[PDB]
Amino acid sequence: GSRRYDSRTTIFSPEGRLYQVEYALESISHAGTAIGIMASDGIVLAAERKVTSTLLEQDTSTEKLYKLNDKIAVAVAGLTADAEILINTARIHAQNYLKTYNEDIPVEILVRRLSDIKQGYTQHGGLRPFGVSFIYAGYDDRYGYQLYTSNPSGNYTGWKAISVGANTSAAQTLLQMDYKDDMKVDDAIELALKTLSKTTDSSALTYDRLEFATIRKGANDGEVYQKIFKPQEIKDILVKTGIT
Amino acid sequence: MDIILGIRVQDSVILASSKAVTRGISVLKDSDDKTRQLSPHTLMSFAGEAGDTVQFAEYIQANIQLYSIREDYELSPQAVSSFVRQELAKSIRSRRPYQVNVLIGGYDKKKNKPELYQIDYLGTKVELPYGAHGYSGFYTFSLLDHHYRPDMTTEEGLDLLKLCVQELEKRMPMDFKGVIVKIVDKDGIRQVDDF
Amino acid sequence: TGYDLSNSVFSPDGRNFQVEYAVKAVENGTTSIGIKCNDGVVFAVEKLITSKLLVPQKNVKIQVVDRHIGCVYSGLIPDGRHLVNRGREEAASFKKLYKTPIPIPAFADRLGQYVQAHTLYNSVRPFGVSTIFGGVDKNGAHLYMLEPSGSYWGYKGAATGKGRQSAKAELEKLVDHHPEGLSAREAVKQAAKIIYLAHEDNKEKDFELEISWCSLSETNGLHKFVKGDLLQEAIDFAQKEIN
Amino acid sequence: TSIMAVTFKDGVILGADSRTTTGAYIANRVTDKLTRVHDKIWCCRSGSAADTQAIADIVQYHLELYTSQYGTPSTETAASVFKELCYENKDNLTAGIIVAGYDDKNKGEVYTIPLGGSVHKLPYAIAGSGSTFIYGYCDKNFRENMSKEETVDFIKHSLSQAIKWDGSSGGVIRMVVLTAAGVERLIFYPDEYEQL
Amino acid sequence: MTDRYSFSLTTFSPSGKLGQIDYALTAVKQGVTSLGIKATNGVVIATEKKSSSPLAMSETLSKVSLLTPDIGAVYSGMGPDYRVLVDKSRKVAHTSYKRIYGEYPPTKLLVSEVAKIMQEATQSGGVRPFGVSLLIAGHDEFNGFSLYQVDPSGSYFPWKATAIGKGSVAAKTFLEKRWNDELELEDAIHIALLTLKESVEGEFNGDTIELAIIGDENPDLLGYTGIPTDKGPRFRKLTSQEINDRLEAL
Amino acid sequence: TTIVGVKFNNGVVIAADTRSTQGPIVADKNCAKLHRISPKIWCAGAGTAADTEAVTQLIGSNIELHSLYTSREPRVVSALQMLKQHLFKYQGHIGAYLIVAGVDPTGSHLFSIHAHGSTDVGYYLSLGSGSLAAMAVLESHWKQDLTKEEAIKLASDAIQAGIWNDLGSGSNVDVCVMEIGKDAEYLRNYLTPNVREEKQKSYKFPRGTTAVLKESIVNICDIQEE
Amino acid sequence: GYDRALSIFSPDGHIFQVEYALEAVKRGTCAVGVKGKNCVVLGCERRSTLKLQDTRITPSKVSKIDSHVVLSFSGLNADSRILIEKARVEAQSHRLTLEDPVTVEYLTRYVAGVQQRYTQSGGVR
Amino acid sequence: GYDRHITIFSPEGRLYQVEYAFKATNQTNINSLAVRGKDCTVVISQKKVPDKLLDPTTVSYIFCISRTIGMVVNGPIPDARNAALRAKAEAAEFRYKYGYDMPCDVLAKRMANLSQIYTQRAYMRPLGVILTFVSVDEELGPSIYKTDPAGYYVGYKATATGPKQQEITTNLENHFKKSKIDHINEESWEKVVEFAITHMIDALGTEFSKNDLEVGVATKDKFFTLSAENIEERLVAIAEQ
Amino acid sequence: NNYDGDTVTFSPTGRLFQVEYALEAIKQGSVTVGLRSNTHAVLVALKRNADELSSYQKKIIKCDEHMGLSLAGLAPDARVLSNYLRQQCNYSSLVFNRKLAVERAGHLLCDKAQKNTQSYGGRPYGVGLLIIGYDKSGAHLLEFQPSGNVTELYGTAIGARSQGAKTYLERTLDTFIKIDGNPDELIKAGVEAISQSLRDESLTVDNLSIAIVGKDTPFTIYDGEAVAKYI
């Protein structure tokens, strides 16, 4: 009698969706709020860190911004233990394609290989599926800039602007009315900054606790250049926007 | 033996593969296709030991076609030679060495320019305006450099090939019973049965 | 509760519940004893006869490791023969490399590798048998009794089974008979009497006398079964003592 | 390098030539040809020094486990371990081995192990390069239960013919006394046996 | 809790967080008080030895271990649980780094593997992760002084002034107000002595108080001369006499 | 290649040159033959220098761990037995000629390894192609219980004699002095018999001598933001 | 499982795994198709109600296995990242080993065989 | 309550299997007394009165791992044999690879790591016995290290395992405090054995005979266990004082 | 009472209850009766079917020319053990060039059956077997039980109403032992014993299966009109 569902995750839940995935969604809401925006001139990525006060040095250490390549970039919102495994794994798969084919790996193929890892845990064995959500920002020579979202269920969908954490549906509403096809790099910086302030309980969002990164097409020869903005440069962003 | 020669003209890429396949002494068949079509914009031949090159270009074509369906985009010819070199690098280091040469060329739709890559049995990627294999290439290397120019059209490259093949069969006793020429341009693969 | 649910788990009383249940499995069965003398060792065990359909000198459970080590167990029949079959491959591994009979003091460790490990691992159930083995080697006579919990000790005499309580008190009386231990044939006559006194609970069915000894006197270091006139001599002697 | 062992009344004396010759050049003449795997149980080594040092050291920790788990080793028990290693390694590892121990019951015992390995009880063992000359000399002067001082001069005069008349074998003769008294190592200057 | 979801710790829990993480946080707050301070001229750490029988040897128990000669560490928790990660961390640093890179890995790359080892224990259903907290401090010529804190969740973050153990709550306010980045290394040593006193006093002598500092390269601790490129270890251990000197001068 | 060593009461000293030659042409003038095991134990390799350093990095990452696990000083025999088991793991396919020299709480010993993995013991040993040349020089210099000053002088004369004889040995010689209770002294460029002479005729060519086809400029830094 | 047993049957002859697997399809998107005389029409339903979705970069739910053989599913897109890739590998393997264009009946047995294999295999769904 | 009864972690933060492993040691009711002398080490454990158990002369609760290395075990015996055979196999390969005797720190360090590995295995339970490794190093001198069921190990001046260990530790606390030294000033091992027996009688509260005591002796370069005549000789000399 | 679902936990009775649950399959299975002598051995087994048109499957599997057995119990646990004995008989007749001993075959079956029951999960064997065979020591019958015990008897009976035939074999035991060399007396003896165990079931040629093996007569399966003379 019974003696099931307590070990292997292959047994389906009474609702048809595994309760382990539902509990992973709650861990995503406990993390920060990362809002990506896909545009023709680049992709803007910004998030608010969990650590606080004055004790932790927030200038050097960034857990929500990781660079896979000079084009593809990821935004980590979720559990760090499950995220670190795919960080080195994606770097291996991206360099193997660059080793074998000598080309930049597309986001659709790269995420598909990473999506099967989260799916393989719910497929074979009772291993824990990754409940961390990745925001994939990359550029290709065919479809241009591609922006997807990694769900703990193991799938991914295309998104122009996606938000995680608290107020997920509320952030997508503010970005819809402010969405523009002619939006430049600077136009996406201010609207993403004002939306993040309203969707979070902390309106302060200093320079150290907030991480800001933007891929720009206006570099030399139109090449993709990823510039990591230090908190010293983030402080100047609040002066231009007039919030702080 | 098994002559495969190719040259990149201005508006297209001219590739020629041998017809007759001689097994041992006697000639078993005088007409055979020594090349494989990867994508409509890319043509690749194979020559080497009997039976190793036939099976080699098959699963390579299956992997390229499989990777193209996943991305809904045709693999660029420049990345094709990189994937072939990766397999040929592991073949010489495995327990069974595989000596396979390929001529990888086509028309890139992104840059709107043709490209031709020459790869020997060692599996080295080399881009040249003309290429050949076997003992027949030794005669055509100095001849094409003295005559062919980057401004030569496709029609002149066909008549120039007739002069080369005529000298290859006259000087060397081997007879391949003609070559199969397939023009690779923006319009796709175009076969030529006049040869 | 989780205490008595899964085995191989510590208990608040200090003793695992599987140990108490393993002893009850050893207590249910025939009565096996042993006697360690100065010239050798003597083994005695009851053979339960269910009906007359049994064929004698067939189902005897005493197995002999090489010629110098006898083995007898009291407990589950399949677990007893399985442990002996392991020790045969274990004792043959020492004589293979070192070319020398395995010493009995170290022979208890080869059998202990299977018993002590199965108590630690959950996937395999521990043995429910108590094996009494012995013999004579270059270091002298030795007699050991292995417990189902994995522990073991040496004994000048030992008693296991249902009648282990009444037989242990009788083995202590043989110590007062001789300080150096009874002789080879003298111990067989005294062992059979202890067996015949242990059938009070087993009198419901028929029994068969089963005795095997290994000494340096008649066998000169060999383990053999009592046959010939030596079997009938111990039967008639102890039959008049219980009268 | 020639190794030999001769039993006496109270035990056996082991000896070896400490010179290691590579080609026409002697690398080191003090090299130890006797590896100690046990206090009272030793084994002689000859031939390639790499295969002998390897097999001797592999058995070294075998007796360490055999001492604590089983008991004190004997000459017959320790010598059988070298045979099992040389049986499977006969093609891969070719080395001569002579195992001569001492016990408190059977006193000394000498077991000759060939290149393929075996166990044979012999009063003396002859192996090594310069041992080619001692076959006829040792058997003539050999006696049963020789004296302790007579056995020392026996091997000293036996190796003297092998050291003086053969170059590959020589050096300082190191003799040891295995008996109930203890372990006593001896050292002999070359001119001692060269003048005799 | 002990629900059906906690039978295998790799499975998620209804509380939103992994149960094995919450069970590990209890042992951290119940452990000894350890801390670290990163100053301009060096990194100083302070900790108190675990109370044991008076017949025990205080010099045998070492709360400070060295993964590499230039990187020190201090921990609060079970003793054996710490040495298991040290045996793996030293092995990986000497295998996947020292061999191919020809040099010891920096503090950032060394801690990255230490957290990765703990992450493998979190994903394994049978293997349970350790409940000990790790404070790792190192010095190099590239990233400079750094002090990292490894949580049982399998991550790591730098901290200028922090503490772990039972006295981590009282030391959070003390080290923030009383210490800043403008203070030197000598002033940080006196603050570390007063920090442990806030949690508990007892005996402040150097017998039960183990102190460790990270300075510049010491040629006496190198063991040889060698090439000028190689330098001595940057770690220096305070003896029992040197600790009492800072106590009377406090 | 000529490498020897001298043992005295307070420690052991070794001598090795910087010359490494591949074939008839000299590949490198300054090549360090000294290999690192522990700070108190130094070794010198010979034969193939590529496989020797690979084994050095193999044991250098092993015994260093065991030294940190025990928190003590490993014995000199430990360094010899590990190197012997390494050649057994590779089945003797790697010829390795080294010298095991160091100190421990037990004392100061000396050992060496061979191609097949044999181990020898002795007070004075030679190594390299000049092993026969340097060993012969010390034959008349043997004396019991030499001092520290005589340990360096007698070792330097054996190396200098091999420089004038063995062509594979020469150029700069590095002497490593290891004393019990003192850090190892590494002397770089101790003996330099080579004297560089100035050219009589100027070989310097003025700018514009060689012909250049075409020029180009590339940048290794990141692309500009603007 | 520690002491637990993973074998599941239930008295109705229908395991709880398949009972709740069909619910994910019913709660997901709806799919429909009609086979005509000269053509096959396959409809698919996607949710565009969410804010700022790009169709071009989004992988289409209708996947093309072969030139004349396509595939369309209904359910979670996570399980489709594997089963679809399996049919694509077999499509190139059928045209290679057998030198035959992909057979619609044979490929259907392979797609249905992947789920068929996991039902009889333990520790996998 | 299911996870609290098995190796899985509990909300209390400490595993109950470690506490139940320590309680199984006091059920055997075997006291032990081990002190560190100057040049030697003497380990004396309380020997329960034998009847038929093992040999009447010596019932061994002290298992010798290797040369000059002793061990005394408290708790269930069936877990002691697997811990004794494992410590011997690690010592054989250690002296083969490093050509040196097993140190006292690593001997208890590798055993402590094995205890944490079995806790990470759900099928196999960890060792519930208290392992005390005793030896005498040449450079470091005599040292004693005890490993609790949790795995923690540290040096002890006087260690005790049993239900009465609190009285043995308290009585021996003032012994080293009065002499102000961490060892016994007596160089010879004859007086060291006579002293440990005297403190053991007053600590436990009763006397003992030659069959009620097992006296281990750890010396340099050699190791031996006193027989029945040597143990009785120490008791007669004390009675003649 | 969780000890009936766990084979690795010692029951308070001292032995697993799953074995007693497996013993019911022997009683609810086919009823067989057999006996032997110093020359030949006879096994009389009953064949059953699930329909009137259903054929009667043979309960006797031949693993050797001189050795055979009969199965009463679960179907899967039977033929799997038959392939093991089939390989052991071919292993001894090839490597050792000698027929497999009856006692050695019993110890191999106990080690294979206990390995699955003692280990976690596994495949417990709950079928009983009566194995007969001839060697230099004569005919031998070893009763195989799922509890792991193998005993050598002159004859016995298992299945439903096994006490009916068991009583007849005990009183007539002294008669059957002295009778040897006659197949007619040994086969007819098993017919009268099984008739007492069978209730509300007729004895026909298709229902009963008789097989005899010995020194003079090898193993032969008597079906159809072959058993019409003996019955």
From Swiss-Prot, chain D:
Q: Which Gene Ontology BP terms does the record give?
A: proteasomal ubiquitin-independent protein catabolic process; proteasome-mediated ubiquitin-dependent protein catabolic process
Instruction: Please tell me one Gene Ontology term that the record gives under cellular component.
Output: cytosol
User: According to its UniProt record, which reaction does this protein catalyse?
Assistant: Cleavage of peptide bonds with very broad specificity
Q: Which residues form the active site?
A: 1
Keyword Protease belongs to the record: yes
Q: What class of enzyme is it?
A: hydrolase
EC identifiers of the protein: 3.4.25.1
| Primary subcellular site in the record, as a coarse category | cytoplasm
| Location(s) in or outside the cell | Cytoplasm; Nucleus
User: What is a single molecular function from GO for this protein?
Assistant: threonine-type endopeptidase activity
Alphabetical list of PROSITE patterns matching this protein: PROTEASOME_BETA_1, PROTEASOME_BETA_2
Keyword list (alphabetical) reads: Acetylation, Cytoplasm, Hydrolase, Nucleus, Protease, Proteasome, Threonine protease, Zymogen
Keyword Manganese listed? The answer is no
What biological function has been recorded for the protein in this entry?
The proteasome degrades poly-ubiquitinated proteins in the cytoplasm and in the nucleus. It is essential for the regulated turnover of proteins and for the removal of misfolded proteins. The proteasome is a multicatalytic proteinase complex that is characterized by its ability to cleave peptides with Arg, Phe, Tyr, Leu, and Glu adjacent to the leaving group at neutral or slightly basic pH. It has an ATP-dependent proteolytic activity. PRE3 and PRE4 are necessary for the peptidyl-glutamyl-peptide-hydrolyzing activity. This subunit is necessary for the peptidylglutamyl-peptide hydrolyzing activity.
Q: What else is known?
A: The side chain of Thr-1 acts as a nucleophile, and the N-terminal amino group acts as a proton acceptor.
- The family this protein is said to belong to: Belongs to the peptidase T1B family.
Q: What is this protein called?
A: Proteasome subunit beta type-1
Q: Which organism is it from?
A: Saccharomyces cerevisiae (strain ATCC 204508 / S288c)
Curated annotation (Swiss-Prot), chain E:
Q: Which GO terms describe its cellular component?
A: nucleus; proteasome complex; proteasome core complex, alpha-subunit complex; proteasome storage granule
Question: Predominant location of this chain?
Answer: cytoplasm
One Pfam short name? Proteasome
Q: Cellular location of this protein?
A: Cytoplasm; Nucleus
> Mind telling me which InterPro entries this protein's record contains?
Ntn_hydrolases_N, Proteasome_alpha, Proteasome_alpha-type, Proteasome_asu_N, Proteasome_sua/b
PROSITE patterns attached to this UniProt entry: PROTEASOME_ALPHA_1, PROTEASOME_ALPHA_2
Site of covalent link Glycyl lysine isopeptide (Lys-Gly) (interchain with G-Cter in ubiquitin): 108
Q: Which UniProt keywords apply?
A: Cytoplasm, Isopeptide bond, Nucleus, Proteasome, Ubl conjugation
Gene3D superfamilies registered for this protein in UniProt: Glutamine Phosphoribosylpyrophosphate, subunit 1, domain 1
Any Gene Ontology biological process: proteasomal ubiquitin-independent protein catabolic process
Cite any additional comment in the entry: Present with 7060 molecules/cell in log phase SD medium.
What is known about what this protein does? The proteasome degrades poly-ubiquitinated proteins in the cytoplasm and in the nucleus. It is essential for the regulated turnover of proteins and for the removal of misfolded proteins. The proteasome is a multicatalytic proteinase complex that is characterized by its ability to cleave peptides with Arg, Phe, Tyr, Leu, and Glu adjacent to the leaving group at neutral or slightly basic pH. It has an ATP-dependent proteolytic activity.
In which family does this protein belong, per the annotation?
Belongs to the peptidase T1A family.
Query: This chain belongs to which protein, by name?
Result: Proteasome subunit alpha type-2
Please tell me the species this chain comes from: Saccharomyces cerevisiae (strain ATCC 204508 / S288c)
Swiss-Prot record, chain F:
Q: Matching SUPFAM superfamilies, A to Z?
A: N-terminal nucleophile aminohydrolases (Ntn hydrolases) (SSF56235)
A Gene Ontology cellular component where this protein is annotated is:
proteasome core complex, beta-subunit complex
Q: Which keywords are on file for this protein? A: Cytoplasm, Hydrolase, Nucleus, Protease, Proteasome, Threonine protease, Zymogen
InterPro entries listed in its UniProt record: Ntn_hydrolases_N, Pept_T1A_subB, Proteasome_bsu_C, Proteasome_bsu_CS, Proteasome_sua/b, Proteasome_suB-type
* Residues at the catalytic site: 1
Alphabetically, the GO molecular function entries are: endopeptidase activity; threonine-type endopeptidase activity
Q: Which reaction does it catalyse?
A: Cleavage of peptide bonds with very broad specificity
Does this UniProt record's set of keywords contain Cytoplasm? Answer: yes
Q: What is its EC number?
A: 3.4.25.1
Known PROSITE patterns for this protein? PROTEASOME_BETA_1, PROTEASOME_BETA_2
Q: Which GO terms describe its biological process?
A: proteasomal ubiquitin-independent protein catabolic process; proteasome-mediated ubiquitin-dependent protein catabolic process
Asked whether the UniProt record includes Hydrolase among its keywords, one would answer yes
What do we know about how this protein assembles, alone or with others? The 26S proteasome consists of a 20S proteasome core and two 19S regulatory subunits. The 20S proteasome core is composed of 28 subunits that are arranged in four stacked rings, resulting in a barrel-shaped structure. The two end rings are each formed by seven alpha subunits, and the two central rings are each formed by seven beta subunits. The catalytic chamber with the active sites is on the inside of the barrel.
PANTHER family per UniProt: METALLOPROTEASE TLDD (PTHR32194), PROTEASOME SUBUNIT BETA TYPE-7 (PTHR32194:SF4)
Member of which family? Belongs to the peptidase T1B family.
What more does the entry say? Answer: The side chain of Thr-1 acts as a nucleophile, and the N-terminal amino group acts as a proton acceptor.
UniProtKB/Swiss-Prot annotation, chain G:
Q: Does the keyword Nucleus apply?
A: yes
Residue ranges annotated as transmembrane are none
Which first-to-last residue range defines the signal peptide?
none
User: Where is this protein found?
Assistant: Cytoplasm; Nucleus
The highest taxon in the source lineage is Eukaryota
Q: Which UniProt keywords apply?
A: Cytoplasm, Nucleus, Phosphoprotein, Proteasome
In this UniProt entry, which cysteines form S-S bonds? none
Main location as per UniProt: cytoplasm
Return one Gene Ontology term, BP aspect. proteasome-mediated ubiquitin-dependent protein catabolic process
Phosphothreonine PTM sites in chain numbering: 58
* One GO cellular component, as annotated: proteasome core complex, alpha-subunit complex
Family of this protein: Belongs to the peptidase T1A family.
Reported function = The proteasome degrades poly-ubiquitinated proteins in the cytoplasm and in the nucleus. It is essential for the regulated turnover of proteins and for the removal of misfolded proteins. The proteasome is a multicatalytic proteinase complex that is characterized by its ability to cleave peptides with Arg, Phe, Tyr, Leu, and Glu adjacent to the leaving group at neutral or slightly basic pH. It has an ATP-dependent proteolytic activity.
Subunit structure, as described in the record: The 26S proteasome consists of a 20S proteasome core and two 19S regulatory subunits. The 20S proteasome core is composed of 28 subunits that are arranged in four stacked rings, resulting in a barrel-shaped structure. The two end rings are each formed by seven alpha subunits, and the two central rings are each formed by seven beta subunits. The catalytic chamber with the active sites is on the inside of the barrel. Interacts with CIC1.
Q: Share any extra remarks.
A: Present with 16800 molecules/cell in log phase SD medium.
Q: What is this protein called?
A: Proteasome subunit alpha type-4
Encoding gene (name): PRE6
Q: Which residues of the full protein are shown?
A: 3 to 127 of 254
